Amino acid sequence: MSKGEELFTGVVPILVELDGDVNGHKFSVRGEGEGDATNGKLTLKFICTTGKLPVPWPTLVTTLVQCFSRYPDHMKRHDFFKSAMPEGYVQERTISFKDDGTYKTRAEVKFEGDTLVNRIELKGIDFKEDGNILGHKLEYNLRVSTPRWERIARVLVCLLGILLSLYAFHVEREHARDPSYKALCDVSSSISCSKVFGSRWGRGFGLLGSIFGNDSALNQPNSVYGIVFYAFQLLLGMTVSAMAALILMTTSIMSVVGSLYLGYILYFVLKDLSVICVTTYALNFILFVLNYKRLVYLNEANSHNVYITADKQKNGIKANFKIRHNVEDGSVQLADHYQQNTPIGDGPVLLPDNHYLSTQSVLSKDPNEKRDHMVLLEFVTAAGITHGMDELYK
């Protein structure tokens, strides 16, 4: 509902110039690219023109054009950023890092010809020398994720289980051709792989084969279900969703209960030892631990939400939020963001109602690029105000 929104009905080129001074370490960044507000899409490439960057790139994303956010149809009325165009607006921000220094940024975002320009000035103080920032101890992404442990461990445990399932599959496929065949885990009686894999409990867990038949494709050797379990847990573990919580939790419950059941078979009815099956029980225990830890790690206390509220005293807007960067050691670095924006001109702007912007960031690297740089893809949307029931009829 602005006259500046009409300047965003298509693809707009974007220039970004930053001159920063962090505890004496001085640098300058220049990033160029384009933005399509119609889809909230941003495609930018940033380079440090002064050689090496003294800070982790993720700590500058929030600082390096919310006027490219795709607003829903009914929320156009609350799009302050577009309204301040072409004359532009000043965006000021303070970023406080827990147990570390503080950034102060003043940026002017305005139209120069066809180009949307963002000229930034940054000064950071009170940073530690061996800290996470000036120590470059931050991962390269803006993800709301669990640390490198548990992720590496999930993929590791899943792959180990998959390989053990393949080996069990082959052992069973050969005990069916020649019962007299020593697998690497057949050391004697009481300790045999083939005894458990050739058992009635080796196909379909001993059950389900008497309900569909011993010839149906559903009565596969348990190692097939194992492969599917570990592989699916992997593919869904990459994703971070509550749906994933449901799926993985049901599968984990079934895994642990069936593990104790098959172990009961091992110790009691079969009176035999299988270190591979015990290993699988351990793997299952781990996967339950991971699903549980992730369930409690879904706390509120992917994309990040920045909550915009009006600022009438300033004829502008305010925002305040938190970015959570992941440290490689396993800890978390909290950056509290404190933002305020005011138009540069004396023209009329949109004072919005409370809402927020969902921001989805993806960082990458250009392989044929020797300078220090960052490739940034972003998707920003407006939300927090639902379209009301349509009543005006009759």
| Residue 293 belongs to domain with CATH number | 1.20.1440.130
Which residues does residue 112 pair with via DSSP β-bridges, in sequence order?
A: 115
Q: Which residue has the tokens 């984990």?
A: 252
Helix ranges restricted to H, 131-197:
148-175, 193-197
- Report yes or no: 30 and 17 within 8 Å, Cβ to Cβ: yes
CA contacts within 13 A on the Cβ side of 336: 9
Token pair recorded at residue 377: 């893809």
Q: What is the rounded CA–CA span in Å between residue 106 and residue 340?
A: 10
Pick from 63, 46, 14: nearest CA to 369: 46
Alpha carbon dihedral 369, 371, 372, 374, in 10-degree steps, equals -40
Determine how β-strand 11-22 pairs with β-strand 115-125.
parallel
Pick from 70, 85, 64, 57: nearest CA to 15: 64
Q: Which residue has the tokens 């009905």?
A: 9
Q: Which domain holds residue 184?
A: 149-298
3-state secondary structure of 368: coil
Tell me if 281 is assigned to a ligand binding site.
yes
Q: What is the rounded CA–CA span in Å between residue 138 and residue 182?
A: 50
- Concatenating the DSSP letter of every residue in 66-116 gives GGG-B--STTGGG-HHHHTTTT-EEEEEEEEETTS-EEEEEEEEEEETTEE
Tell me if 305 is assigned to a ligand binding site.
no
3-state secondary structure of 29: strand
Pick from 324, 379, 385: nearest CA to 356: 385
Which string of b and e fits 275-291 if b means at least 16 CB within 10 Å? ebbeebbebbebbbebb
Token pair recorded at residue 178: 């020649």
The residue type of 199 is S
17 phi, psi to nearest 5 deg: -120, 125
3-state secondary structure of 129: coil
User: Please, which residues have CB within 8 angstroms of residue 389's CB and are 6 or more apart in sequence?
Assistant: none
- Concatenating the DSSP letter of every residue in 348-366 gives ----PPSEEEEEEEEEE--
Q: What is the rounded CA–CA span in Å between residue 18 and residue 186?
A: 67
Inter-axis angle of helices 275-296 and 222-238, nearest 10: 30
Which residues does residue 327 pair with via DSSP β-bridges, in sequence order?
A: 138
CA distances from 344 to 35, 96, 106, 113, 353 (A): 22, 26, 13, 17, 21
Radius of gyration of the chain (CA): 28
CA contacts within 13 A on the Cβ side of 347: 16
| CB-count burial class (<10 Å; 0-12, 13-18, 19+) for 91 | buried
| CB-count burial class (<10 Å; 0-12, 13-18, 19+) for 73 | exposed
CA distances from 61 to 190, 305, 375 (A): 61, 14, 11
- Which experimental technique did the depositors report for determining this structure? X-ray
Residues in the chain: 394
CA distances from 204 to 139, 211, 213, 214, 258 (A): 43, 10, 10, 9, 12
- Report yes or no: 386 and 164 within 8 Å, Cβ to Cβ: no
Residue 30: alpha-carbon gap to chain centroid: 26
Token pair recorded at residue 126: 């009170």
The H or E element spanning position 375 is strand 373-383
Q: What is the rounded CA–CA span in Å between residue 44 and residue 36?
A: 11
**Residue 271 CB: number of other CB atoms within 10 A?**
11
Q: What is the rounded CA–CA span in Å between residue 243 and residue 236?
A: 9
281 phi, psi to nearest 5 deg: -60, -40
223-226: long-range contacts, CB 8 A cutoff, minimum separation 24:
223/165, 223/166, 223/168, 223/169, 223/172, 223/197, 224/165, 224/169, 226/161, 226/162, 226/164, 226/165, 226/168, 226/280
**Residue 387 CB: number of other CB atoms within 10 A?**
9
CA contacts within 13 A on the Cβ side of 242: 3
Counts of helices then strands in the chain (DSSP H, E): 7, 11
Q: What is the rounded CA–CA span in Å between residue 254 and residue 252?
A: 5
Tell me if 193 is assigned to a ligand binding site.
no
- Report yes or no: 157 and 285 within 8 Å, Cβ to Cβ: no
Pick from 18, 15, 30: nearest CA to 122: 18
